[PDB]
């Protein structure tokens, strides 16, 4: 196709990260509003950005959920790493959950630069490394001032389905946040 | 990282690595020579090498272990397999709107007759679009110029 | 390790240095920065380059940025090494002063090693003279090849 020095031919290759589904989670993107983190070939996690809210509570009962191991510890770990990676997290009233019956669901109210809405989108942008840029309109050239039009960021548990249309899955997203965990929080 | 990768039972030479048809998307299996993959243990600045250790660890963990879902295992070997700061570099490049590597596509120089290939470097992406061959042509030139020197030794 | 990538030579402007003019270093010198992991001067180049690069390519409202690239720029354990030397009252490097060997005629310089300090006083040239000797002896071998 294209030769260099007359003898060397330029060739390419594209890796299929879907193989790693058993050992590590894989993050991909469907459309502007929906993003996913697949942990296995059965269970998974859905990252959605919608103006429509699901949880009306203002309190997140974790201790009650921790007693009843109905949830999946794998999915509960990858959502635990997310919250710790959020920088400069101070107000907890914007965070609401609902772990009744094992169904894990967390909602972040983004209606409240250098705000709590940025930190959530900042961690979310790294988590869905595949196609996060489609979500933010002012992504390029903005770090602390990233913003959206959506009001809520909901994370729910879902079953595996072939919906990685916009971007192929990859673990690099989740891998990066493991080091960032518990490194930008204030004192309680 | 400290993971040592090696293809046991590999026919051609010891130390090389082959990517199966399942490891690649819409492509057949591809093998790489010892001279190329040897740089993976030496250098710390290659994204493709980090993927090989992930694919090898994923393969190694599957055949040698009993799955119960096995998330704790990776959460401990992360730093021993990939270069965490190499992920940070690409994120900084994306934040500054520099062409960055999303770890999917790679490019290498394959000899038409000899068959010796270079270590595939990552194909950078800008605005969800891979760079044209022209925009990093001089990167291929230094690779082709380095391909000669390595064979000379 | 670190991964920041800083043709290939580096020049320190008159603003980067204190009471000194701009100074440039050859490719062969700065090439050691990517190879070795235990050089303080190289960590400063990546800090000055990251600070320079971030300014022109970004719009300041910027503390969160550095808090994520610290490990990708400098060697954290290299800072710990100097702290241990200070705690044990060994001459340590406070990252301010460096010394290098400049060829009077050729102009080739070595990679500037840190000038150690003991009790707020920089060491005399005599107290680390043998360090300069091994550097000058190594400078020849590089010049030969």
């Amino acid at each position, epitope marked *: 196709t*294209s*030769l*260099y*020095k*007359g003898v060397y031919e330029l060739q390419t290759l594209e890796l299929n990260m879907e193989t790693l589904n058993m050992t590590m989670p894989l993050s991909c993107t469907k459309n502007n509003s929906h993003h996913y983190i697949m942990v296995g070939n059965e269970t998974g996690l859905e990252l959605t950005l919608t103006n429509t809210s699901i949880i009306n509570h203002k309190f997140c009962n974790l201790s009650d959920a921790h007693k009843k191991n109905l949830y999946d510890h794998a999915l509960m770990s990858i959502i635990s790493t997310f919250h710790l990676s959020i920088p400069n997290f101070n107000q907890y009233e914007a965070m609401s959950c609902d772990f009744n019956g094992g169904k894990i669901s967390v909602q972040y109210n983004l209606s409240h630069c250098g705000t709590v809405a940025n930190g959530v989108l900042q961690t979310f942008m790294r988590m869905a490394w595949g196609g996060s840029y489609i979500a933010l309109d002012s992504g*390029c050239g903005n770090w602390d001032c990233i913003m959206t039009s959506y009001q809520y960021l909901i994370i729910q548990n879902t079953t595996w389905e072939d919906h990685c249309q916009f971007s192929r899955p990859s673990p690099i997203g989740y891998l990066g946040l493991l080091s960032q965990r518990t490194r930008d929080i204030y004192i309680s | 990282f400290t993971w040592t990768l090696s293809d046991s039972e590999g026919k051609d030479t010891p130390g090389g690595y082959c990517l199966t048809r399942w490891m690649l998307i819409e492509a057949e299996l591809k093998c790489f020579g010892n001279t190329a993959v040897a740089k993976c243990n030496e250098k710390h600045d290659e994204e493709f090498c980090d993927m090989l250790r992930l694919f090898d660890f994923n393969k190694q963990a599957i055949q040698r272990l009993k799955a119960p879902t096995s998330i704790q295992l990776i959460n401990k070997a992360v730093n021993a397999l990939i270069n965490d700061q190499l992920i940070m570099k690409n994120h900084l490049r994306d934040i500054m*709107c*520099i*062409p960055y590597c999303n770890y999917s596509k790679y490019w290498y120089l394959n000899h038409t007759t000899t068959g010796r290939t270079s270590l595939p470097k990552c194909w*950078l992406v*800008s*605005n969800g*679009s891979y*760079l*044209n*061959e*022209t*925009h*990093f*042509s*001089d*990167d*291929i*030139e*230094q690779q*082709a*110029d380095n391909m000669i020197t390595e064979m000379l030794q | 390790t670190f991964t920041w*990538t800083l*043709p*290939g030579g580096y020049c320190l402007t008159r603003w980067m240095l204190i009471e000194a003019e701009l100074k440039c270093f050859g490719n062969t010198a700065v090439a050691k920065c990517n190879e070795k992991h235990d050089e303080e001067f190289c960590d400063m180049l990546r800090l000055f380059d990251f600070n320079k690069q971030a300014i*022109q*390519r970004l719009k300041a409202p910027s503390i969160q940025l550095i808090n994520k690239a610290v490990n990708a720029l400098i060697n954290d354990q290299l800072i710990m090494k100097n702290h241990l030397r200070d705690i044990m009252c060994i001459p340590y490097c406070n990252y301010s002063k460096y010394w290098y060997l400049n060829h009077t005629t050729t102009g080739r310089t070595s990679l500037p090693k840190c000038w150690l300090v003991s009790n707020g006083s920089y060491l005399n040239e005599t107290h680390f003279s043998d360090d300069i000797e091994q550097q000058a002896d190594n400078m020849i071998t590089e010049m030969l090849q």
Partner: antibody, heavy 123, light 111 residues
Framework: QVQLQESGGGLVKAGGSLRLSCAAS????????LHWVRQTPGKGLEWVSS?????????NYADSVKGRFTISRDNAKNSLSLQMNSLRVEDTAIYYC???????????????WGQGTTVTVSS | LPVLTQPASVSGSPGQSITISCTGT?????????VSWYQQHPGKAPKLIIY???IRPSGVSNRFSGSKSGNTASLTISGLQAEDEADYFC??????????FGGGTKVTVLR
């Protein structure tokens, strides 16, 4: 000082041929990629052709130029050449040779430009 | 025909701030962030005033600034001075060719 100098401009008949040169002064010629940008005396700049660094394996031409111009380089001789053929009257412009580096990691823009050589086409 | 559309001329009083717009297609200006601006004085060769949209080469006055929004780049010259009266061109990476240049704009310091 880092310099680039052109040579070979002059009067040529319509349909003839002309040969241009570009010499380096004060930098490593091989590492960089070189281009040819002509400027119509009364109009803006137009990119013509490009040559990759080291071995000139990657060559690019403009659609208004393709098939008629042929670029070449000699790293040892530090000379960049452009061969013109089937010259049209509209090719009359001031031709410059500029450098840059096409790297994904450390790219270089068209920083160094030559003084330019004037080429006139009229039979 | 010029690939990038540039205004005929932009003018301003000494000490003012004027901006030149470099409008392109989605395949060039919008695709990449390699947009360059050149200052050409009469008789001289184009001098690289800004590269990579907003990065400024060493030795260029801090009065020159670059911007971009979608398919349009903007070169802003604040604190106009008589020495700035020259012709300005813009260039960018392209999917079809390595470089695509603009028609050019003449900046006049209204005296």
């Amino acid at each position: 000082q880092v310099q680039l100098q052109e040579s070979g401009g002059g009067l040529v008949k319509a349909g003839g041929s002309l040969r241009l040169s570009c010499a380096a002064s004060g930098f490593m010629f091989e590492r960089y990629s070189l281009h040819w940008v002509r400027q119509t005396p009364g109009k803006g700049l137009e990119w013509v052709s490009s040559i990759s660094s080291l071995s000139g394996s990657h060559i690019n031409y403009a659609d208004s130029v393709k098939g008629r111009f042929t670029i070449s380089r000699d790293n040892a001789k530090n000379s960049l050449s452009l061969q013109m053929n089937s010259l049209r009257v509209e090719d009359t412009a001031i031709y410059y040779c500029a450098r840059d580096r096409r790297s994904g990691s450390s790219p270089v823009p068209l920083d160094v430009w030559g003084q330019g050589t004037t080429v006139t086409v009229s039979s | 025909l010029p690939v990038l559309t540039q205004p005929a001329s932009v003018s301003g009083s000494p000490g003012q701030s004027i901006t030149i717009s470099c409008t392109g297609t989605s395949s060039d200006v919008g695709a990449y962030n390699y947009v360059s601006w050149y200052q050409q004085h009469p008789g001289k060769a184009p001098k690289l005033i800004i590269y990579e949209v907003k990065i400024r080469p060493s030795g260029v006055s801090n009065r020159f600034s670059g911007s971009k929004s979608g398919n349009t780049a903007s070169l802003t010259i604040s604190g106009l001075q008589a020495e700035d009266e020259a012709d300005y061109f813009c260039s960018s990476y392209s999917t079809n060719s390595p470089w695509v240049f603009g028609g050019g704009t003449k900046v006049t310091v209204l005296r």
